[PDB]
Design a protein around this ligand. Structure first.
Ligand SMILES: [Mg+2]
Ligand SMILES: [Mg+2]
Ligand SMILES: [Mg+2]
Ligand SMILES: [Mg+2]
Ligand SMILES: [Mg+2]
Ligand SMILES: [Mg+2]
Ligand SMILES: [Mg+2]
Ligand SMILES: [Mg+2]
Ligand SMILES: [Mg+2]
Ligand SMILES: [Mg+2]
Ligand SMILES: [Mg+2]
Ligand SMILES: [Mg+2]
Ligand SMILES: [Mg+2]
Ligand SMILES: [Mg+2]
Ligand SMILES: [Mg+2]
Ligand SMILES: [Mg+2]
Ligand SMILES: [Mg+2]
Ligand SMILES: [Zn+2]
Lengths: 115, 217, 37, 174, 111, 69, 148
RNA sequence: UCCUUAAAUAGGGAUGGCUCCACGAGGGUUCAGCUG
RNA sequence: ACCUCGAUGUUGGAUCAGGACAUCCCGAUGGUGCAGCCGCUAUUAAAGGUUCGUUUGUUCAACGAUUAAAGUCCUACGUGAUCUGAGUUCAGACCGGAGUAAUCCAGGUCGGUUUCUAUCUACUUUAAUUCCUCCCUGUACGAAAGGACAAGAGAAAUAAGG
């Protein structure tokens, strides 16, 4: 569950995600009627003093059985259109993303590992 | 004789017929899927069919950090780190879509719950994905791994040092001061091991369950 | 329709009819002329 | 417990006749009514999900209390105002629960989801009244299921089509 | 049936400027075929994606659930995920900047 | 610099051979991709990157991690 | 292919001139809120719009509301966006304001007047009971020549 | 007008005039952490 | 200046809201300078709903991000025997100003006690909504751009009840 103000880890190849900054990326908005983001939900993110959309691809909060619970709240940066900003995702990405409603094919294509 | 935990019911007012029915279903599924004996701390590889794909199997290897639930809903959550990312999965034992459960390394740990591995060093959760299964002698008590893990800095998911957790597998002397340990002792509750009415005697229940299992065989 | 306190026929085909209790200016040719009292 | 069921004369059954779980069938939809779990006198926060008041920042002796109960003008409290009081222990009905399976040996009905009331409480079970399930009684035993009829001794377990029966080979989404 | 043969036939019929196919091994829990195709422009991409989707819809597999079309709002990359195959339509610059080929052939042996 | 002088050339030969029976993909694009991979990089690496490059090329040849059809 | 339209930027709201009084401070001082700025007007390009046939009449930008009591400011007028085809030349009476070509290319065609100041704006240690009520400045209004 | 925030009615900076060493249950602002 | 000066500060906020409709969204319609989508306008509709943050004591406002929408109001500017006291208001002190001074100030600032055990009335268990995706269907319409109705399925989310 990623809400507003959660510090999230950008698991992505993008320069924004991988560049140092005095402030850790924070969720600014959860694109969901209840501001609670799960895997597959989009969120605004304050990176490097910039507003950027991103996709949740894993979180510490337990989910339904058979699905992975990660040690960190992992997020992937995406453009407003939806193209992922980075070109590679290193850490494992849950396979449950595939059947969820919404566009995830680009993220799955960029993903290296699945869990 | 290892009676899998899920068969033993938690005490309550629920009717025994419900447990008989649930055990019937559990055993009748076990006839199809071989649920091996394993304990919290043993390394397991679980193969499960993915509905997201089209009849394709997924394998996850990790250390069983908790055995929870009773009856048909019983689960075990097992942990690992993949590319430096700690991942835990809670697997339902009797889910029709777990194709296989392999006990790669059958062993017991000092604690019945290894949830503190989240706060332990990542090395203690890392397990080779392709590790080969070790072999235990047919007649042999399950090994008890007396490993005491080293913890990462004090801010932890839970106050593991507190007595109510009763953790024996953590090297507290390394991370916590004697003052901190003494402070944690303020929650000791020594009477809690001596209140005889709190103890749950399951000898008769286990005997009846064993009779049921043997009859099913 | 347009609500008017005084109804005025605009073209030749605007006709007054009292329907459901009130007056209306209907018009086949120019439905823009539709008025309701 | 004795519960009254409204029926058409077509379905009258002689008093004294037993009824069995197989009176229902898998895939049917059912309504289950029972007394909910009695929680006794419960405050407004638990009974009605009121937000209560903040824990700190000065609040004195008001954390779980109802706020204003009405406006100043009416000079009374409207009937039906949400106030602390007894919660639960009232009859509630869950509608449209699917019957997933029937154990004829022990007369067990497996009803989808949750049912009101505690374990070992008597629930009144009837064919669902929802419009979507208005005329699904064609294939159900109309008056009731009569084992004495012995038209076909039912299996020990009747399953709905989609249920992953235990003992079947592990499902593969091929 | 609706298979990779039908996919490639339709794509060549509409004359995709470039086609590539990857046989995804079973142990990878995504799909069976990874089709990557380039196109002239966003209009061309949309046209061919709509065409192949209509063909899938009308051909067969009524019991098989319908299929999304992802990337409509973006102009340089669309993608359609079928039951056992996934097609990634894009432009040459998007393809060369994302190098999906190396990703999906060299799973852990690229940058 | 590489594992062996002929290893890379034999690898390229094997890739082209395996493309000979290429069926579904665009043969010309496949050849262009191989040429790019083996020309834009394999001129002036250091001695250490050669081992990694030839290893990844060999894995691609094997195709157990996904093959081009 | 050629069109003349009239725009009218929003007029700022007018400030208020009130005075506050409450049970233990009868002379609570100036209590007039500022008026809200008028709404800007903007021309924007759309690939969907083919020509200037779907044009209209005086595009009136919304006016900011007036200041209220309790120092309540007035809501600034909402921004009105006009839409035009790609590749539209916008001119004033000879002067060329913008050649709008790109999708979504947008230009401010008429600013909105600054809102008036309420009497509390003029409160100071020197001026303890201002009554001055500055009206909202008007917004730029002009005719636009549109040609593709 | 600049920095600080995604957003900054807040904060910081572009005899007299300055210089705050240290101190402060003083009054503001802030990083990080911590937390019902 | 008509009631209340023989213990009722006030503003905001919290809690809980009752109501009006002059409707912000959702519903049904007429017209259009509505081809379609879209708007604009008007009739009808009050069952339901009507966000979270930064500055500021703020109501407002600006700004950021959303939303189907972030409606206008009344209710002792609803509601302190339910809460809070940040502005303002009492005794302290500065800055600026007036004053010979004492003192004062519609100004700026730092600080500053919020009692009540309920007698009576009243009251304390009275058929969901929206959005998105998909099908229809990139079909109608349209030169194109663009893009529907109506009907149906699936997902969520919220609300209510368990
Ligand atoms: Mg910034
Ligand atoms: Mg925690
Ligand atoms: Mg609370
Ligand atoms: Mg308290
Ligand atoms: Mg602040
Ligand atoms: Mg001192
Ligand atoms: Mg008089
Ligand atoms: Mg009196
Ligand atoms: Mg009305
Ligand atoms: Mg009034
Ligand atoms: Mg105060
Ligand atoms: Mg004073
Ligand atoms: Mg003052
Ligand atoms: Mg003060
Ligand atoms: Mg103090
Ligand atoms: Mg009080
Ligand atoms: Mg009381
Ligand atoms: Zn007429």
């Amino acid at each position: 569950a990623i809400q507003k103000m959660t510090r999230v880890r950008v698991v992505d190849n993008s320069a924004l995600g991988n560049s140092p900054y005095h402030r850790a990326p924070r969720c600014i908005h959860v694109y969901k009627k209840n501001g609670v983001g799960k895997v597959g939900d989009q969120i605004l993110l304050a990176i490097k003093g910039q507003k950027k959309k991103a996709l949740i691809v894993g979180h510490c909060m337990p989910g339904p059985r058979m699905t992975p619970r990660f040690d960190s709240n992992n997020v992937v940066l995406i453009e407003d259109n939806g193209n992922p900003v980075g070109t590679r995702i290193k850490t494992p990405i849950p396979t449950s993303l595939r059947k969820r409603e919404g566009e995830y094919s680009k993220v799955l294509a960029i993903a290296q590992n699945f869990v | 004789r290892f009676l899998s935990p899920e068969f033993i019911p938690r005490r309550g007012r629920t009717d025994p017929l419900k447990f008989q029915i649930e055990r019937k279903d559990m055993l009748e599924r076990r006839k199809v899927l071989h649920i091996p004996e394993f304990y919290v701390g043993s390394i397991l590889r679980v193969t499960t069919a993915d509905p997201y794909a089209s009849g394709k199997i997924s394998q996850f290897l990790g250390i069983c950090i908790q055995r929870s639930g009773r009856g048909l809903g019983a689960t075990f959550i097992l942990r690992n780190v993949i590319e430096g990312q700690g991942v835990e999965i809670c697997f339902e034992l009797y889910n029709p879509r777990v194709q296989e459960i392999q006990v790669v390394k059958l062993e017991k740990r000092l604690d019945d719950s290894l949830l503190y591995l989240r706060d332990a060093l990542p090395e203690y959760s890392t397990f080779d994905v392709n590790m080969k299964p070790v072999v235990q002698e047919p007649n042999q008590k399950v090994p008890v791994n007396e490993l005491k893990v080293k913890m990462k800095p004090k801010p932890w998911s839970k106050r593991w040092e507190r007595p109510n957790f009763n953790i024996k597998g953590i090297r507290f002397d390394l991370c916590l001061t004697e003052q901190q340990m003494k402070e944690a002792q303020k929650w000791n509750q020594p009477w809690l091991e001596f209140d005889m009415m709190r103890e749950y005697d399951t000898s008769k229940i286990e005997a009846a369950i064993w009779k049921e299992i043997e009859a099913s065989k | 329709f347009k609500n008017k306190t005084v109804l005025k026929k605009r073209c030749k085909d605007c006709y007054l009819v009292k329907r459901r209790g009130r007056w209306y200016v209907y018009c086949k040719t120019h439905p823009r002329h539709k008025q309701r009292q | 417990t004795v519960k009254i069921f409204n029926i058409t004369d077509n379905a009258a059954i002689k008093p004294g006749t037993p009824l069995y779980a197989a009176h229902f069938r898998p895939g049917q939809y059912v309504d289950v009514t029972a007394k909910t779990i009695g929680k006794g006198f419960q405050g407004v926060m638990k009974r009605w999900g009121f937000k209560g008041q903040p824990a700190t920042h000065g609040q004195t002796k008001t954390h779980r209390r109802p706020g204003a109960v009405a406006t100043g003008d009416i000079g009374r409290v409207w009937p039906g105002t949400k106030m602390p009081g007894k919660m639960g222990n009232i009859y509630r009905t869950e509608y449209g629960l699917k019957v997933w399976r029937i154990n004829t040996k022990h007369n067990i009905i497996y009803v989808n989801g949750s049912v009101p009331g505690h374990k070992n409480c008597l629930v009144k079970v009837k064919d669902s009244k929802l419009p979507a399930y208005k005329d699904l009684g064609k294939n159900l035993p109309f008056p009731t299921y009569f084992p004495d009829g012995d038209e076909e001794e039912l299996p020990e377990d009747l399953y709905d089509e989609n249920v992953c029966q235990p003992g079947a080979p592990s499902i593969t989404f091929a | 049936k609706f298979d990779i043969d039908m996919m490639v036939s339709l794509l060549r019929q509409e004359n995709a400027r470039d086609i590539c196919v990857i046989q995804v091994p079973p142990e990878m829990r995504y799909t069976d075929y990874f089709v990557i195709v380039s196109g002239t422009s966003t209009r061309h991409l949309h046209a061919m994606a709509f065409y192949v989707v209509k063909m899938y819809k009308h051909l067969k597999c009524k019991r098989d659930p319908h299929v999304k079309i992802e990337g409509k709002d973006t102009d340089d990359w669309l993608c359609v995920d079928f039951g056992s195959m996934v097609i990634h339509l894009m432009l040459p610059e998007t393809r060369e900047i994302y190098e999906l080929e190396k990703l999906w052939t060299l799973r852990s042996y690229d940058d | 610099a590489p594992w062996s002088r002929e290893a890379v050339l034999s690898l390229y030969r094997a890739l082209l051979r395996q493309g000979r029976q290429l069926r579904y993909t665009d043969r010309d694009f496949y050849f262009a991709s191989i040429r790019r991979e083996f020309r834009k990089n394999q001129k002036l690496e250091d001695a250490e990157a050669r081992e990694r490059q030839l290893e990844k090329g060999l894995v691609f040849l094997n195709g157990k991690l996904g093959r081009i059809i | 292919d050629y069109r003349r339209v009239l725009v009218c930027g929003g007029n700022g709201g007018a400030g208020a001139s009130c005075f506050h009084s409450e049970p233990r401070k009868e002379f609570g001082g100036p209590d007039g809120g500022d008026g809200g700025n008028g709404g800007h007007v903007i021309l924007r390009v759309d690939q969907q719009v083919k020509s200037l046939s779907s044009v209209l009449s005086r595009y009136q930008g919304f006016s900011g509301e007036d200041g209220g009591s309790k120092n309540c400011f007035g809501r600034s007028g909402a921004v009105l966006y006009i839409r035009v085809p790609v590749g539209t030349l916008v001119k004033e009476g000879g002067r060329v304001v913008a050649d709008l070509s790109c999708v979504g290319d947008e230009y401010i065609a008429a600013l909105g007047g600054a809102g008036g100041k309420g009497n509390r704006f003029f409160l100071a240690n020197n001026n303890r009971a201002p009554v001055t009520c500055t009206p909202g400045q008007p917004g730029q209004q002009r005719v636009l020549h549109l040609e593709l």
